[model samples]
Target: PGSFKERRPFHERQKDVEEIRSQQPNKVPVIIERFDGERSLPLMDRCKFLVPEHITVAELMSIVRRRLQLHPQQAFFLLVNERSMNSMSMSNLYSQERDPDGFVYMVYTSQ
Candidate 1:
């Protein structure tokens, strides 16, 4: 029985995402991004105005999830500025090479 499928339903990825999102006490902004219909990573860089491209935020998550062999429907609690939840995502304000720049500090992903 090597079915390999997670049984969580691949198309329903958002269902898992939503439940995890709801548990977060700080994400008051909804953070429902449009992504300008890009539906990919490069667009995210443009949204943040980052000149040099590194990797898609989404791709990074997917990669880590694989390297760690995490369940696709894994529960993640992204924490940003727990001291004061002003904004959740900081891709526009911070880079991996740089230290926390203070727009809003956080742990971007979790299980």
Candidate 2:
């Protein structure tokens, strides 16, 4: 189970990231904030980016985790409305919540 062989299925991993991307949303934007459990981390010069509407948080996290370049001891989690949302679909998240400040807060930790 420790091996990649045990990782989640392709549907869950969004193996068709590009194919699924062709469905809709000319431009989907989100302001991403970064922070470890104790404090904020260094974000890319620009935190806003566009993604497909159907992307799952797992997929988005895959992108951010790469961008974050976290060390071996570090990992991150996603949140919406301050609730754990790492397993939810972003499309559903779009409908369930909206940030008045126009940014989504992502909490992370070294754990």
Candidate 3:
């Protein structure tokens, strides 16, 4: 399947982000997906997430791991815009990496 951006029109996605941001000022809109060709980890049932701005990348990673019900021995990494991000608050990362449509897109992989 294609990404959310590919599936929806630009204007519609932009409007959705605008409305979501207005309704929840303290939350950051995020879209999480498995890396292309990745098969070790199962896809998340829900890709869209509204995470608190104050949380750190570590916290977000933990949440993702739990959502996937990953085994302790399993290794996975979260990539923001196809690259690794530093340990920082979600707000900071959002400001730097947010797409024009207003969502922080992330990909997960077990490589």
Which candidate ranks first by TM-score, i.e. highest?
3
Q: List the residue pairs that clash in candidate 1.
A: none
Tens digits of lDDT, candidate 1, 1-111: 111113324345344335544664232111211122222222111111111123333543454355446678874433333321233133432333222221222333432
Q: Which stretches of candidate 1 lie over 4 Å from their true place?
A: 1-54, 77-97, 100-111
Runs with alpha carbons beyond 4 Å of true place in candidate 2 = 1-26, 100-111
Which residue window of length 10 is worst by lDDT in model 3? Answer: 78-87
Off by over 4 Å in 3: none
Predicted structure 1: lDDT = 0.32
The full ranking of all candidates by TM-score, starting with the best, is 3, 2, 1
TM-score of 2: 0.58
Error of 1 at 8 (Å): 40
Residue-level lDDT of model 3, residues 5-74, one tens digit each, is 7887899989989999899988999988888868889988888899999998878888888999988667
Instruction: Report clashes for each candidate as comma-separated counts.
Output: 0, 0, 0
| For every candidate, C-alpha RMSD to the true structure in Å | 16.4, 13.3, 1.3
- Cα-based lDDT at residue 59, candidate 2: 81
Alpha-carbon lDDT, every model: 0.32, 0.53, 0.87
